[PDB]
# Entry
Amino acid sequence: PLIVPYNLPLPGGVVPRMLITILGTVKPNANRIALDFQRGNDVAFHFNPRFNENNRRVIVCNTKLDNNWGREERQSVFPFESGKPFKIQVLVEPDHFKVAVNDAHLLQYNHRVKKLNEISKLGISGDIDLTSASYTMI
Ligand SMILES: CO[C@@H]1[C@@H](n2cc(-c3ccc(Cl)c(F)c3F)nn2)[C@@H](O)[C@@H](CO)O[C@@H]1Cc1cn(C2(C(F)F)COC2)nn1
Ligand SMILES: [Cl-]
# Structure
């Protein structure tokens, strides 16, 4: 187990068939979780579970370019529960990131940042106890 915030290096960036697995437990009374796939200061893919946005649970995804957030993609399907162990899997495909939680498909996010081989860091932050962060090629 690791203390958040945690930075997982992605040397030479990401590539199709790369499967990133994040294991942990959501804290009790969690407010937020964030995964940030970064290309330098740009955030290619921000994955942001919010547990109380106007008393609703929502997944927010976005990209940050030149320090500016773009158009949010939102999902009401919310597989996380406070206090419970989770597995987030991000599968890199040619045209999108595919996300599954606890072995159930959640969403896809089309690549806005095109240079996959420069997306060289994954930041993990928010209201979790982080057990592990690793990747493999499927
Ligand atoms: C409150 O900041 C968040 C941003 N955010 C979260 C974290 C964050 C830090 C620490 C932790 Cl531990 C953690 F979990 C975290 F989510 N940092 N930045 C990020 O979630 C962003 C996603 O779109 O939304 C917000 C910023 C934002 C959105 N927008 C609009 C458009 F441009 F997107 C939507 O109408 C205009 N303008 N600004
Ligand atoms: Cl944090």
The first strand starts at residue 6 and ends at 9. The chain has one domain: 1-138.
